[PDB]
Amino acid sequence: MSGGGVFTDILAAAGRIFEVMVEGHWETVGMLFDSLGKGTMRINRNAYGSMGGGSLRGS
């Protein structure tokens, strides 16, 4: 554990810290994201009901 052994564990810890920290980040997103993810789905669908299959056809 001299060199990168411990350091990688530190990396593993922080990564895991940040990771569990990240999960919580998206926990609140179900709110902010919903403001333009749930309702957006409608925007996109409509924006795709013809705009994304005939006008631009996504290509």
Swiss-Prot record:
Compartments where located: Chlorosome, Chlorosome envelope
Cellular component aspect of the GO annotation: chlorosome envelope
Domain of life: Bacteria
Entry keyword annotation includes Transmembrane helix: no
Listed GO MF terms: bacteriochlorophyll binding; metal ion binding
Keywords: Bacteriochlorophyll, Chlorophyll, Chlorosome, Chromophore, Electron transport, Magnesium, Metal-binding, Photosynthesis, Transport
GO biological processes: photosynthesis
Metal-binding listed as a keyword: yes
Signal peptide start-end: none
Residues engaged in binding a bacteriochlorophyll c: H25
Family membership: Belongs to the BChl C/E-binding protein family.
Task of the protein: Component of the photosynthetic apparatus. The light harvesting B740 complex binds bacteriochlorophyll c.
Protein name (database record): Bacteriochlorophyll c-binding protein
Originating species: Chlorobaculum tepidum (strain ATCC 49652 / DSM 12025 / NBRC 103806 / TLS)
Complete-protein stretch covered: 1 to 59 of 79
